[PDB]
Design a protein around this ligand. Sequence first.
Ligand SMILES: O=C(O)C(=O)C[C@@H](O)C(=O)O
Ligand SMILES: [Mn+2]
Lengths: 429, 18
Amino acid sequence: KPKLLNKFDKTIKAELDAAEKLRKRGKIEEAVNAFKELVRKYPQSPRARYGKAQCEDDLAEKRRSNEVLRGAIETYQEVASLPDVPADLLKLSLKRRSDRQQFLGHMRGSLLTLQRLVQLFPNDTSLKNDLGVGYLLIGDNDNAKKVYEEVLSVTPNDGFAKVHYGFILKAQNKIAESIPYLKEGIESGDPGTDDGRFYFHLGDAMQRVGNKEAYKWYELGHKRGHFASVWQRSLYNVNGLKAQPWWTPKETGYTELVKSLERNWKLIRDEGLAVMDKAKGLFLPEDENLREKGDWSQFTLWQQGRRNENACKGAPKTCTLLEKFPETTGCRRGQIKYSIMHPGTHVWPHTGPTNCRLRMHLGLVIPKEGCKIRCANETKTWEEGKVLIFDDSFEHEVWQDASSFRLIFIVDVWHPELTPQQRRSLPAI
Amino acid sequence: GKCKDGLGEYTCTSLEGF
Ligand SMILES: O=C(O)C(=O)C[C@@H](O)C(=O)O
Ligand SMILES: [Mn+2]
């Protein structure tokens, strides 16, 4: 179906299929030498050079080697530099180059590759859509937006562009404008629209505007395997971890951490108040669009398993204390932070990204009335000097209706059933 | 841009290879 052989390559088709036969038989090093031979003897042959690239790609998998993949990536480029390359082959080679650049994390190189592809193939909608993802992957949502706006001008019912356009709208807090794009997009069934991110955000946008259809989509996303439950909608998960919204210390096994937080709560409180009074800039406003209204700021000591040395200058004894507990300081999918919330604050229902952490809250300054936190179907209050533990991969919601500030200390821990192997290896979040 | 309390980024992990 794909014509990958130019006029000259047809005259050596037999030698080309022989080396490709070797590659599909898994005979990778024999196949590497064979495509090298063809390359040295026919250095202009696009199909030969692609063969060498695909072998180097497979070898990078056999060896799990980034350096070998870096060479494959250059050879895929070489294919495109040669004369008389058939369009099917040029597109296959540059597409895979971009895919492997992203896999390594060269998202800026991927973007240049993708821009070239769109220039070479200006009627291919799927490439313009891939370019959008390129821009999303480097956090350039303004250029991604323009890309899917171009695509939707020409093909208004391209669903991939509709769910990605929705996602962007929603990230810009255009909740109502995003709901029809996400809904119609998912409903299109086009490749790339059955993704947990889009169910996640569609239901959340509906919850925000007050549409009881929201849980219809959470049910569906659950039915299609994106969510472990209708209530627990995290997307970076290890399957099989125990799942309950509220935990006791004993249930977690981190009883020594919990005792240290409760015994030494006042030194933690006092260092937080000192920062509020003399270094309030260390408290950064929440910036994940989780607030309906109000004021909510966090002062973070550890994130992604890494101590913030400047921040720990503002809470030095607290950071000394926590160092004894690698179940939190090495939780690379969690944080350690103070969190201040003031009256008139409502945090939208939301879910954290991963089921691999549990969240501890130590009460530090808790007004007598007006502060509560719901996780799933149960609402609780904090207590000064006491720890509450919840799984923030379950939906949860917070209110602050007191007459003065509420300060807590937040300590993320590795889910207790995760092995030491998993805790060393899971990518950070 | 990182996913701390939510799922607002397009991707929450950072691709850095094998
Ligand atoms: O801990 C969470 O996950 C929350 O959403 C609430 C928290 O930031 C707070 O200050 O109450
Ligand atoms: Mn939360």
